[PDB]
Amino acid sequence: PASRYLTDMTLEEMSRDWSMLIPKQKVAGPLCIRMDQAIMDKNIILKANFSVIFDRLETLILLRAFTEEGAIVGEISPLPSLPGHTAEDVKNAVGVLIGGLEWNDNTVRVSETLQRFAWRSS
Amino acid sequence: ASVPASRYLTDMTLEEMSRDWSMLIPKQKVAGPLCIRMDQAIMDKNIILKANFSVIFDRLETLILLRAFTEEGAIVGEISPLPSLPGHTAEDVKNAVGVLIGGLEWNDNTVRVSETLQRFA
């Protein structure tokens, strides 16, 4: 099947409202990165929702960052203009958020489903 | 013939080492034996990391002070051993520097490492 939607998150998790106590935000190419500076010493799970064409990444719809208690503390997503992006853009945006969260000695686990596609080649 | 097994590498001047600097908006971390700091206000600049450090044979042994400088000569960042001085490794420094670079890059600063730090890191 040549188009699949890979959904780390639930519906409720995709659309939930969240807020940063101490906002940090950055534009990496065609992607916006967000993280709450207030958060420290937490293990953090990256959950991604994205699409895939044949066996390669198509689009990242949304990635959110979760504490082990289910609280959202960060997010990556496409710029409101919704432009095209590469796996490399993504690899890069994920790296930059890992660095950001790691400042307050949080541990970050990437989405294994996304990384399986984003760290691919030809 | 050859150069000592111990050398002292000085990318900075005495005035450069002892100068105080202000972080407009502080961003500090401790990585074990190392303090990392930088000014969060700083944006879109070109920045060079410079270092005063010891070498044994061909590898950084002990860091004395690393600073981050704007093209104008303003210090915008710093990696310094904590003052009880409980020992760090060449590797502990490579790592700290990655953390300063990434933190600085957040605000679209462009960062270079000195050629010295490049040889002996």
Author numbering:
A (entry chain A): 85 to 206
B (entry chain B): 82 to 202
Give the text the authors published on this PDB structure.
During infection the influenza A virus NS1 protein participates in multiple protein-RNA and protein-protein interactions to perform a plethora of functions. The N-terminal 73 amino-acid residues of NS1 form a symmetrical homodimeric RNA-binding domain (RBD), which is connected to the central effector domain (ED; residues 86-204) via an inter-domain linker. Present models of the tertiary and quaternary structures of NS1 indicate that the protein possesses two globular domains, each capable of forming independent homodimeric interactions. Our bioinformatic analyses indicate that the N-terminal RBD forms a very stable homodimer, while the predominant and ubiquitous helix-helix contacts between C-terminal EDs bear many similarities with weak transient interfaces.
In contrast, several possible ED homodimer interfaces have been proposed based upon crystal structures obtained using NS1 proteins from various strains. While the helix-helix interface appears to be the only dimeric form of NS1 ED consistently observed in all crystal structures, it remains possible that other dimeric states (such as the strand-strand dimer) contribute to dimerization in solution. Although the helix-helix dimer interface is shared by all structures of the NS1 ED, and may have some biological role in that RNA-binding activity of NS1 is affected by its disruption, we noted that in all helix-helix structures the arrangement of the two ED monomers differs markedly relative to one another. However, at this same concentration we routinely observe complete dimerization of the PR8 and Alb/76 NS1 EDs. A key aspect of our functional model is the instability and flexibility of the NS1 ED helix-helix dimer, which seems weak and transient in vitro, but may be slightly more stable in the context of the full-length protein, or become more permanent in the presence of certain binding partners. ED dimer flexibility is likely permitted by the presence of several glycine residues at the homodimer interface (a putative GxxxG protein-protein interaction motif) that allow the two helices to rotate easily relative to one another.
